[PDB]
Amino acid sequence: AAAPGKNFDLSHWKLQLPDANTTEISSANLGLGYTSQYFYTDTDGAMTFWAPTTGGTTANSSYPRSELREMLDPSNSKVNWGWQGTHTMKLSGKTVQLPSSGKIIVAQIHGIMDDGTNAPPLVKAVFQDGQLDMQVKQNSDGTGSDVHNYFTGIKLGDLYNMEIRVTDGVAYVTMNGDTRSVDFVGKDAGWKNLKYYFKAGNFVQDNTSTGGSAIAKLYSLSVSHS
Ligand SMILES: O=C(O)[C@@H]1O[C@@H](O[C@H]2[C@H](O)[C@H](O)[C@H](O)O[C@H]2C(=O)O)[C@@H](O)[C@@H](O)[C@@H]1O
């Protein structure tokens, strides 16, 4: 019954919560065994993220989350990685319960300005009962639309194996050994002006009062920069 920080390497993740005040838990406190209604180890050992649709939201989102936010430097969220080189997150997990909207985001690459100011998400792994859509943003200024990458057949409760990789300004998005790519720096050179961090957890795409809540699980989670 050990807390997730004992089962996963959370030394370079902080946790963002869907409580009224959108509390954050540090890497160190995750390692010490932080657990709550929003974040816990289930009977199957999974790191489990729960968030209600009525939860608190961050300053630039309509939606609540129980979600890890990568910290290259666990003591400074303004230290983030760039477009050049290779940057890889791998995970395995499942979504157990959806809100009324039937949509959550279970993994991301998020952009950020050099000064820590918000920038657009780059990759969003959107889960629905029957499909994961690994969406890649076109433009670094947040305008335009997203490039969709549909992986159909993935159901509620099914185990997915996922990888999101950036190598030299190209995003490679993988679900169960099936990989698609989007050259994001090639769509917009402006992406070279931004930095990036991974996210993984449960970002609930429903903020309605009667929308219920969602549960997402992870069985493995690793990040590498090379
Ligand atoms: O809505 C936003 O601005 C959020 O930005 C990111 O989280 C940042 C936010 O300021 C949050 O309250 C806390 O201070 O962490 C910040 C960070 O880690 O950069 C982003 O991860 C997401 O929560 C949302 O887009």
The Cα–Cα gap between 186 and 21 comes to: 39
DSSP track, 190-211: GGGG-EEEEEEEEEES---TT-
Candidates 15, 69, 78, 105: which one to mutate for ligand 1, based on the most atoms within 8 Å of Cβ? 69
* Strand ranges in 98-177 using DSSP code E only, listed in sequence order: 104-112, 118-128, 131-137, 146-147, 150-152, 160-167, 170-175
The four Cα atoms 74, 69, 136, 84 give a dihedral, to 10 degrees, of 10
| Nearest protein CA to atom 3 of ligand 1, as residue | 60
Place of tokens 């050990």: 2
Candidates 24, 70, 118, 198: which one to mutate for ligand 1, based on the most atoms within 8 Å of Cβ? 118
Domain of 70, in residue numbers: 1-226
Length of the chain: 226
Q: Are 31 and 11 in contact (CB under 8 A)?
A: yes
CATH number of the structural domain spanning residue 159: 2.60.120.200
The Cα–Cα gap between 181 and 170 comes to: 7
Q: How far is CA 67 from CA 28, 63, 147, 184, in A?
A: 16, 12, 23, 24
| Nearest protein CA to atom 12 of ligand 1, as residue | 58
Name the method of structure determination.
X-ray
Q: 177: CA distance to ligand 1 center in Å? A: 31
| Nearest protein CA to atom 16 of ligand 1, as residue | 77
> What's the domain count of the chain?
1
